[PDB]
Enzyme design. Sequence first.
Site, PDB file in Angstrom:
ATOM      1  CB  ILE A  19      -0.938  -0.089   1.215  1.00 14.55           C
ATOM      2  CG1 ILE A  19      -1.984  -1.205   1.017  1.00 14.55           C
ATOM      3  CG2 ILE A  19      -1.573   1.256   1.558  1.00 14.55           C
ATOM      4  CD1 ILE A  19      -2.763  -1.502   2.274  1.00 14.55           C
ATOM      5  CG  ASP A  49      -4.111   2.795  10.098  1.00 21.36           C
ATOM      6  OD1 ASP A  49      -3.822   1.644  10.353  1.00 21.36           O
ATOM      7  OD2 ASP A  49      -4.222   3.707  10.994  1.00 21.36           O
ATOM      8  CD  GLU A  66      -3.620   1.853  13.703  1.00 15.85           C
ATOM      9  OE1 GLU A  66      -4.014   0.926  14.568  1.00 15.85           O
ATOM     10  OE2 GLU A  66      -4.223   3.022  13.435  1.00 15.85           O
ATOM     11  CD  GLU A  67       0.152  -2.031  15.836  1.00 14.85           C
ATOM     12  OE1 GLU A  67       0.097  -2.586  14.734  1.00 14.85           O
ATOM     13  OE2 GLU A  67      -0.639  -2.357  16.785  1.00 14.85           O
ATOM     14  CE1 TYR A 116       2.246  -6.353   8.546  1.00 16.83           C
ATOM     15  CE2 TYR A 116       1.657  -8.413   9.665  1.00 16.83           C
ATOM     16  CZ  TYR A 116       1.283  -7.189   9.118  1.00 16.83           C
ATOM     17  OH  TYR A 116      -0.054  -6.846   9.209  1.00 16.83           O
ATOM     18  CB  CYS A 158      -7.621 -10.881   7.087  1.00 19.25           C
ATOM     19  SG  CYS A 158      -9.205 -10.369   6.383  1.00 19.25           S
ATOM     20  N   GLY A 159      -5.873 -12.395   8.821  1.00 19.58           N
ATOM     21  CA  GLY A 159      -4.880 -13.142   9.571  1.00 19.58           C
ATOM     22  C   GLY A 159      -5.326 -13.328  11.022  1.00 19.58           C
ATOM     23  CB  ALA A 160      -3.314 -13.142  14.150  1.00 19.66           C
TER      24      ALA A 160
END
Length: 517
Positions: A286, A297, A315-316, A355, A430-432
């Site tokens: 992005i 975000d 985000e972080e 990540y 999504c994911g975790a």
Amino acid sequence: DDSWRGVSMEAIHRNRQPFELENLPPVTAGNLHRVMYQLPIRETPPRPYKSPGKWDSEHVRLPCAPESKYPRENPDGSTTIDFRWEMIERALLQPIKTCEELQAAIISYNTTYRDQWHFRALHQLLDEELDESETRVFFEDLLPRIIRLALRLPDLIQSPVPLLKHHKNASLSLSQQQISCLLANAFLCTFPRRNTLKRKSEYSTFPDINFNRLYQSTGPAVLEKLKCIMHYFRRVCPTERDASNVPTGVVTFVRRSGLPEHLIDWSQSAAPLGDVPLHVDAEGTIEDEGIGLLQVDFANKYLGGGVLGHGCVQEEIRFVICPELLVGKLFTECLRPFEALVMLGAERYSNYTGYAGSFEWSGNFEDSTPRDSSGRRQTAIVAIDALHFAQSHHQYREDLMERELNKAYIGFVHWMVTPPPGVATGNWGCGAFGGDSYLKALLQLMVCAQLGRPLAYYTFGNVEFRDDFHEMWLLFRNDGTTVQQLWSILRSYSRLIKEKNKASKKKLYDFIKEELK
Ligand SMILES: [Cl-]
Ligand SMILES: [Cl-]
């Protein structure tokens, strides 16, 4: 042999150069837009705007406010009530040569937290990560610069800073310079009334802003975020010599709050889904490939999430490579379900690899993104907070598919006369966090269809999902499938799942070729 599928990037931009479409109107001072510098901008950096300061429930409690008082216990055991800003100056202009003295200085105006705060990530970075000589540079060069900048707050902020509360459509614009000062204050944990952990406190609907919670955290991702922050200050603080490195422009924060009027009834959207110019890419990001677009975000309802804490996902990461976003935390109340926050102007200062636990600072970034008429870099980010699911299946409830459609809706609205650029997004919530990639891609398409926005979707290394999403867009394109029609099918899936990823996409196939006769 290409990374992407669907329409091309040139096409996402309507075969017009990136940056020809703007995501926000120019900055003008108004009843609904507070501006912390003088308009129009003549000198750079922008000259601060002067008006009577405010110590109240509607504005930031500035550390330099004459209303800010503090008890000091003295040598002799007695109390003196003093001006907290004057205590802050005295503490921070003592020499500070080690991490223990830095902490003691900060604690001296935060004495309530003497035995609760321990700046272990700062001890780890300065005593274990850096060699003797880089640590000496932090105390001889960087920290003095951060202090001098923090202490210029009453020179750089000379008007009240408003809070952006709940249910109020409002904008705030500040100079990048003004933000550096606010952030230097946060680094030194100077913001009054913003430390208490008590459950039902004045600012408990606002994010944290003092950096102490970052310093209290552990692990390598945390040290790396500290490195990003150190680097930001090295970039934006004046050096002993000159102030020519100080950033020149502006950042604008816009709280979008939808009225009941603005709610789309999704079963009435006649918008063809295939008419959305869709570009799905399995490489790219992005922040890199989404230039000129409204970049998303994947936010927490508290802006910035756990950036001052253990958090280190989309985000972080964006809040530490583009640290001017952090100041949103100072004045942005948490997002209600029909709200979003648009952030335009945030300069990128850092590169990164990895990540979550593998996140690392991987070097200086010289941002050359062009500035708009208002002096903002044309980097437009919307914070929209997905729901988190402990239970995947819950997200298929009709009420929580509509909640997400409407969240993305208020994020992706344009409300300008000029036409909207595309959105750059990806696997939102999504994911975790429990979100289904497959569902969340469709919801985002439905919203873009309805608003007439191209959609650049980044699958971040997932070729398989790139294709399943592309394929579904082709199926909608030549079936001329519509928003209300996919909504209908999606509502069906709600009632099927209440009996019991790749399965959501199999059932539309089914409920779609049943139409084909
Ligand atoms: Cl004192
Ligand atoms: Cl306080």
